[PDB]
Amino acid sequence: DFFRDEAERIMRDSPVIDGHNDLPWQLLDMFNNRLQDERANLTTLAGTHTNIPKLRAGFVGGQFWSVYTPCDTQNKDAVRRTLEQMDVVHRMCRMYPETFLYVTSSAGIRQAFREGKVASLIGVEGGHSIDSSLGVLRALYQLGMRYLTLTHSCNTPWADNWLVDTGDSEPQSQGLSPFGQRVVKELNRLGVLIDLAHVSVATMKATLQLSRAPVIFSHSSAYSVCASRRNVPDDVLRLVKQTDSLVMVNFYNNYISCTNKANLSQVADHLDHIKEVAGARAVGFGGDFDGVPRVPEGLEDVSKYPDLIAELLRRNWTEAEVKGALADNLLRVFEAVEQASNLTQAPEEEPIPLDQLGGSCRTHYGYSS
Amino acid sequence: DFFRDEAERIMRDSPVIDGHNDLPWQLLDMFNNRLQDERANLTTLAGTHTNIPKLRAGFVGGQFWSVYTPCDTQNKDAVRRTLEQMDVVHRMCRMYPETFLYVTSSAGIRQAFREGKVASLIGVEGGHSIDSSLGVLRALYQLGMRYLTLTHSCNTPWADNWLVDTGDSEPQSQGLSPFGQRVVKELNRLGVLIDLAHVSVATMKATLQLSRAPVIFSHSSAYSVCASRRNVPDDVLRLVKQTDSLVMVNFYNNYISCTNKANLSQVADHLDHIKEVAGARAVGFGGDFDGVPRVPEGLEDVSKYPDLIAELLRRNWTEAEVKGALADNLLRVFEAVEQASNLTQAPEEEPIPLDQLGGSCRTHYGYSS
Ligand SMILES: *[C@@H]1O[C@H](CO)[C@@H](O)[C@H](O)[C@H]1NC(C)=O
Numbered sequence: 001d002f003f004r005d006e007a008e009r010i011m012r013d014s015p016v017i018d019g020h021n022d023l024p025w026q027l028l029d030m031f032n033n034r035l036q037d038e039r040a041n042l043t044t045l046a047g048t049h050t051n052i053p054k055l056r057a058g059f060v061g062g063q064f065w066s067v068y069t070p071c072d073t074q075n076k077d078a079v080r081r082t083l084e085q086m087d088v089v090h091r092m093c094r095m096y097p098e099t100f101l102y103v104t105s106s107a108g109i110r111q112a113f114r115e116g117k118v119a120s121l122i123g124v125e126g127g128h129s130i131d132s133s134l135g136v137l138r139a140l141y142q143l144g145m146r147y148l149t150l151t152h153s154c155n156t157p158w159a160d161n162w163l164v165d166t167g168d169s170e171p172q173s174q175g176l177s178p179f180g181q182r183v184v185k186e187l188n189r190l191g192v193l194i195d196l197a198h199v200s201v202a203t204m205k206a207t208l209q210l211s212r213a214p215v216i217f218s219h220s221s222a223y224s225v226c227a228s229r230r231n232v233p234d235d236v237l238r239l240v241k242q243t244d245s246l247v248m249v250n251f252y253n254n255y256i257s258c259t260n261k262a263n264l265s266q267v268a269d270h271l272d273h274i275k276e277v278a279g280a281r282a283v284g285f286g287g288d289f290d291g292v293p294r295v296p297e298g299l300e301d302v303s304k305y306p307d308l309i310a311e312l313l314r315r316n317w318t319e320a321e322v323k324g325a326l327a328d329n330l331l332r333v334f335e336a337v338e339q340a341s342n343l344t345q346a347p348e349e350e351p352i353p354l355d356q357l358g359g360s361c362r363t364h365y366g367y368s369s
Numbered sequence: 370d371f372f373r374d375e376a377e378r379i380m381r382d383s384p385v386i387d388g389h390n391d392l393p394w395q396l397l398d399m400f401n402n403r404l405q406d407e408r409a410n411l412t413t414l415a416g417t418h419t420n421i422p423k424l425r426a427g428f429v430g431g432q433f434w435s436v437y438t439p440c441d442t443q444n445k446d447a448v449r450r451t452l453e454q455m456d457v458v459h460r461m462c463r464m465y466p467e468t469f470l471y472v473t474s475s476a477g478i479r480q481a482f483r484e485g486k487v488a489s490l491i492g493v494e495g496g497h498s499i500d501s502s503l504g505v506l507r508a509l510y511q512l513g514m515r516y517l518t519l520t521h522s523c524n525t526p527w528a529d530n531w532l533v534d535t536g537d538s539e540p541q542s543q544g545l546s547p548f549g550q551r552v553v554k555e556l557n558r559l560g561v562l563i564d565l566a567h568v569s570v571a572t573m574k575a576t577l578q579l580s581r582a583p584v585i586f587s588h589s590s591a592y593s594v595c596a597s598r599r600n601v602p603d604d605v606l607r608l609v610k611q612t613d614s615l616v617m618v619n620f621y622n623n624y625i626s627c628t629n630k631a632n633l634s635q636v637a638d639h640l641d642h643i644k645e646v647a648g649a650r651a652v653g654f655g656g657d658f659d660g661v662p663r664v665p666e667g668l669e670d671v672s673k674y675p676d677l678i679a680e681l682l683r684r685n686w687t688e689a690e691v692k693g694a695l696a697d698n699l700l701r702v703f704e705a706v707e708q709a710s711n712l713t714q715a716p717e718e719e720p721i722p723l724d725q726l727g728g729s730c731r732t733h734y735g736y737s738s
C-alpha cells in the first residue's frame with residue numbers, strides 16, 4: 001500500500017515519540033522488577049503490548065516510560081514504590097544499551113534518534129508520588145523525572161482528579177490549592193513538563209492559566225468524539241492552542257469509541273478533531289500501551305504505529321502535520337519547558353500546611369510555629 | 370601555645386574531614402528546612418555547634434553531612450524525609466557556594482581542598498531510610514549517598530542495632546539476614562562506604578567478615594575507655610585492623626567519659642586507645658556535632674578542632690599520625706571502596722521476603738501477597 005510505504009518513509013526520519021507507556025508497571029506486577037528472570041527478557045517478552053522487536057517494528061524512537069504507583073499507595077508507600085519504578089527504567093536502559101538510550105533532555109531525544117536508539121525518559125504519573133513535598137519533587141527531578149502527571153485517578157491535597165467531573169470524587173482543591181500553585185511554579189522553575197492527563201477540568205484550566213510554560217496531556221483524547229472525563233473538552237483545547245500546548249492521544253478503546261470495541265479509524269477521528277479545534281501543532285501520541293486492557297483493532301501493539309500514520313496520510317494530513325504529531329510537537333513543547341526553567345532561581349521551600357497532610361503513615365518533624 | 374600553632378600549620382595542608390554532623394536535622398527541626406529564613410542564615414546561625422564562621426575557624430575542609438530521619442519514621446515516612454533531608458543538603462551547598470562544595474567522590478574531597486572549600490558529602494544514617502529496598506538504595510546512591518549507616522538505634526528487618534547489646538532490643542537478624550547480606554553486597558558494588566555506627570557487635574563482625582571493602586564507624590568511640598555499646602570493643606578493633614577499616618571518634622560526653630560531663634583530654638584518651646589497638650590508620654573524627662546535647666569542655670563547637678590536634682601533638686603523636694586522623698585515613702578507605710565497586714556488575718534485584726516487611730504503611734504489588 002502506498003500510504004503504508006509513505007508512513008515508513010517519514011517514520012525513518014521522524015520516529016514516533018510516545019508520551020505514555022506502562023511497561024514498568026508490567027515488569028513489577030509480572031516479575032517484581034526482577035529483570036534477570038528469563039521470562040522477563042525484553043527481546044522476547046510476550047503477553048505485553050511492548051517489547052524490543054515490536055518497538056523497532058513500530059518505528060518508535062522515543063518513549064516516556066511511565067513510573068506509576070497506584071492511588072492506594074498514597075499516604076503509604078507511594079514514594080518508595082516511585083523510586084523502585086524509576087530504578088527499573090534506569091536498569092532496563094543499562095541491560096539493553098543497544099536498544100534504549102536513557103535521556104532527560106530534548107537534545108537527548110534528538111541524540112537517540114541519531115543513534116538509532118529508543119530515547120527513554122521518565123514520566124511520573126500521579127502527584128501522590130511526591131507526597132506533598134517540594135524536596136521529593138526535586139529528588140525525582142534529579143532521578144530523571146521529566147513530566148509529572150499532577151494527579152492520577154485520585155485527589156492529592158493540592159490538585160483534583162478527573163473523577164471529580166464524573167461525581168465519584170469530591171472537589172477538594174477546586175483546581176490547584178496555594179501549595180499546588182507552588183508545585184506548578186517549582187515544576188516550571190525546574191523545567192519539568194506539566195502533564196494534565198487524569199486531572200479535573202478546573203485543574204486543567206487553573207494550570208493552563210498559571211503555568212509559565214506549555215503543558216501536555218500525555219495520554220488524553222477528544223471529549224467531543226468520546227465523552228469521557230479522561231478526555232479533553234473543546235474549551236480546554238482552545239486554551240491548549242492559545243498556550244501552544246500539546247495533547248497526546250490515548251488509544252484505550254473506552255476513551256476512543258467510549259465502548260469496549262474500537263479500531264484504528266476511530267483513533268484517527270480523535271486526532272482530526274484535536275487538529276481542527278486545537279490546531280495541528282497541538283497533536284501527538286500517548287498510546288497508553290501496557291496500561292490499558294483493550295487496544296484498538298489495527299492498533300494491537302507498539303508495532304502498529306505506521307498503520308495509524310498511513311490513515312492520517314490517507315485522510316490528507318500533510319507530511320509536516322504527521323511529523324509534528326510524530327515527534328516535532330513534543331520537541332517544541334519540551335524545548336519551551338526547558339527555556340522557561342530557571343535553576344539559579346531560589347527553589348520553592350514553603351511546605352504544605354500540616355493540616356493538609358494526610359494519612360496515618362507520617363511523622364510531623366519540622367512543623368511547629 | 371606551640372602545639373596550637375603547629376596544629377594550625379598541619380591543618381592548612383590537612384583539613385579535618387569529619388564523618389558525622391547533624392546540622393541537616395537542626396535545619397529541619399528549627400526552620401522546617403526553610404533556608405531562606407533569615408534566622409537560618411548559616412553565616413550568622415546561632416544556637417548550633419555548626420555554621421560557616423565556626424567551620425572555617427575549626428579548619429574543617431570535609432564534612433559528611435548526616436541525612437537522618439528518626440527511628441519512629443521507619444515503616445512510615447522514612448523515605449520521604451530522607452529525600453527532604455538530602456534535598457536540604459543539596460540546596461545548602463547551592464545557597465552557600467563560596468563555602469560548600471558538594472562532592473560524591475574522593476577526588477572531589479581533594480578538589481574541595483585545593484579550592485579552599487568545605488567538601489560536602491552525604492551520609493545516610495539508618496537503614497530504615499531505604500525501607501528494605503535495593504531500588505531505593507540505588508536511588509539514594511544517585512542522589513548523593515556515599516555512606517549508609519546500616520541501622521540507627523532501631524533494628525531494620527535485615528540488621529541489628531546496638532540496643533540489642535544492652536538488652537533494650539531483641540536480636541532479630543543476629544547480624545545480617547540473607548537480604549541484609551545482599552544489601553552489603555549491593556553497597557560494595559555501588560561504592561558506598563558501609564557505616565557500622567549504631568549497629569550490634571554481631572552486625573559489626575558479620576559486616577567486617579562479609580564486606581569486600583573496608584568499612585567505617587562514622588561516629589563511635591572506644592569501648593575500653595567508656596563502656597557504652599555505641600562504642601567499639603577491642604575484638605572488633607582487631608577486625609578493624611585486619612580489614613584496614615576506620616573508626617571516626619564521637620565527641621558526645623556520655624560516650625567519652627561515660628557521664629554528662631567530659632573534656633577535651635578524655636577524647637584524646639579514646640584516640641590514643643584506638644591508635645594502640647586498631648592502629649594509627651584506623652582512627653579519625655566523627656564528632657557528632659549538632660546531633661548530641663553534650664560536647665566536651667574545650668570542644669564546644671566545630672571551631673575547636675585545632676585544640677584536639679594540639680593535645681595529640683602534646684601526647685607525642687607524629688605529624689603523619691595526625692595527618693592521617695585528619696584526612697588521610699578516610700581518604701584511603703574511600704578510595705579502597707571506589708576501587709572495589711563493580712558498576713558494570715548486575716545490580717542486586719532479589720527483593721526482601723514479603724513476610725519480612727513490617728508496618729501497615731505499604732502495599733504488596735510485585736509480590737501480590
Ligand atoms: C535475551 O534473550 C536473547 C535471545 O533469547 C539473548 O540473545 C539475549 O542475550 C538475552 N538478553 C538478556 C539481557 O538476557
Ligand SMILES: *[C@@H]1O[C@H](CO)[C@@H](O)[C@H](O)[C@H]1NC(C)=O
Pocket residue numbers: 316
Ligand atoms: C488535500 O489537501 C490539499 C492541500 O493542497 C487540497 O488541495 C485538497 O483539496 C485536499 N484533498 C481533499 C480531498 O480535500
Ligand SMILES: *[C@@H]1O[C@H](CO)[C@@H](O)[C@H](O)[C@H]1NC(C)=O
Pocket residue numbers: 410411412413464465
Ligand atoms: C546571610 O546574612 C549575611 C549578613 O548577616 C548576608 O551578608 C548574606 O548575604 C546572607 N546570606 C544568605 C544566603 O542569605
Ligand SMILES: *[C@@H]1O[C@H](CO)[C@@H](O)[C@H](O)[C@H]1NC(C)=O
Pocket residue numbers: 685686687
Ligand atoms: C615521640 O614520638 C617520636 C616519633 O616522632 C618517637 O621517636 C619518640 O620515641 C617518642 N617520644 C616519647 C617520649 O615517647
Ligand SMILES: [Zn+2]
Pocket residue numbers: 125197198219291
Ligand atoms: Zn493514565
Ligand SMILES: [Zn+2]
Pocket residue numbers: 020021022066068125291
Ligand atoms: Zn499509566
Ligand SMILES: [Zn+2]
Pocket residue numbers: 494566567588660
Ligand atoms: Zn548517630
Ligand SMILES: [Zn+2]
Pocket residue numbers: 389390391435437494660
Ligand atoms: Zn546523627
